[PDB]
Design a protein around this ligand. Structure first.
Ligand SMILES: Nc1ncnc2c1ncn2[C@H]1C[C@H](O)[C@@H](COP(=O)(O)OP(=O)(O)OP(=O)(O)O)O1
Ligand SMILES: [Mg+2]
Ligand SMILES: [Mg+2]
Length: 338
RNA sequence: GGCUUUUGACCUUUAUGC
RNA sequence: GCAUAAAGGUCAAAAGCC
């Protein structure tokens, strides 16, 4: 029980309940190998029109290394050559959702594996079960347009790519509805972080699931991850820190949701006039404001004022729980941010 | 400090797709 | 070169146990 776990033993809680088991990371690497192989080697050979898979991006928990044991998805982004514009991705993702299912079910007719389902939807979702899986791994398969292309790190994406995105997102009314194209940037924001930050994120995520079971409608889990990176960057910066403090710090950010204005300039900045103007309007929006580091149009925590109202009421309640109290019963401190 | 596990960086391969 | 999985090597971060 996270609620009754002493603050001192939070790292032990993460170690044997949250950190991936070797069995788990073996279960996942295999399940991915099956589908990556499937997508590349059979799914689109039989071409009424040449469909080429340029990439299959491992994203979400798996890509970042923020997986909860036995509870994390496998999120695979499929970059297709026929998808050439963002609107192409919007207009044609559904065709490809339906085709991939059709191929998977054909591969289920052959006894290669089993699969359980489940423009309009964003992803194909299913539980894959092979011989060496059985209990099955859950999947989200995301067809997407390669807006970034192949790229060497240590360099920002071309700002023109973001000019296109912003113009396209506002010509239409779907801001942040193309975050998928920038999954590699979403990933590399967390993937290279110090180890214990990912651990802390795992802890925050499990706490979040325990609120989802209780409250139902809630802000995206990604928002809470970004809050944790924010809490870490502003209140610590050490590879070695106090988990109970960081956990309390994130909870208080959630409480301070009516004041949050958070953004990073890792993949975009204000040098380009069109981006500069858009970003500045974004920081103006009602609180909280949590910009996706990979997508300036992606405002997390922008959807539900009620969702944060409830999440803050649970976080407030949690501050009295044994996990924020030391041996002597004194409260754990929270970091003072920047 | 010892043992182990998790998460990464870089380097070299193998299969596969582009 | 990029992407997935695997194999070898070099380095590192943290955690569990002692
Ligand atoms: N940018 C976003 N905006 C709104 N919702 C999002 C966004 N990104 C993800 N989600 C939601 C939709 C999905 O149904 C749900 C699952 O995301 P997911 O890919 O599984 O992230 P994750 O892998 O890091 O968390 P998990 O621990 O569940 O695996 O989160
Ligand atoms: Mg996932
Ligand atoms: Mg998912």
């Amino acid at each position: 029980d996270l609620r009754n776990t002493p603050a001192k033993s939070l790292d032990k809680f993460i170690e044997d309940y949250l950190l991936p088991d070797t069995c788990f990371r073996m279960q996942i690497n295999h399940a991915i190998d099956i589908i990556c192989g499937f997508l590349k080697e059979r799914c689109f050979r039989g071409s009424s029109y040449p469909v080429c898979v340029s990439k299959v991006v491992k994203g979400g928990s798996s890509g970042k290394g923020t997986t909860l044991r036995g509870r994390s998805d496998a999120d695979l982004v499929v970059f297709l050559s026929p998808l050439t514009t963002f609107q192409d991705q919007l207009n044609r993702r559904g065709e490809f959702i339906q085709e991939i299912r059709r191929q998977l079910e054909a591969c289920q007719r052959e006894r290669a594996f089993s699969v359980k389902f489940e423009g309009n939807p964003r992803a194909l979702s299913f539980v894959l079960s092979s011989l060496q899986l059985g209990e099955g791994v859950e999947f989200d398969v995301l067809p997407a347009f390669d807006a970034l292309g192949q790229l060497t790190g240590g360099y920002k994406p071309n700002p023109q790519i973001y000019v296109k995105l912003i113009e396209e997102c506002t010509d239409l009314q779907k801001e942040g509805e193309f975050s998928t194209c920038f999954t590699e940037l979403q990933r590399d924001f967390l993937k290279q972080r110090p180890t214990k930050l990912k651990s802390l994120i795992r802890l925050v995520k499990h706490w979040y699931q325990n609120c989802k079971k209780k409250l139902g409608k809630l802000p995206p889990q990604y928002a809470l991850e970004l809050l944790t990176v924010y809490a870490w960057e502003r209140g610590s910066m050490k590879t070695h820190f106090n988990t109970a403090q960081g956990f309390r710090t994130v909870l208080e950010l959630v409480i301070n949701y009516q004041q949050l204005c958070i953004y990073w300039t890792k993949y975009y900045d204000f040098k380009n006039p069109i981006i500069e103007k858009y970003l500045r309007r974004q920081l103006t929006k009602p609180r909280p404001v949590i910009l996706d580091p990979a997508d300036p149009t992606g405002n997390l925590g922008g959807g539900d004022p009620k969702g944060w109202r409830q999440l803050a009421q649970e976080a407030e309640a949690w501050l009295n729980y044994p996990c924020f109290k030391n041996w002597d019963g004194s409260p754990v401190s929270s970091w003072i941010l920047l």
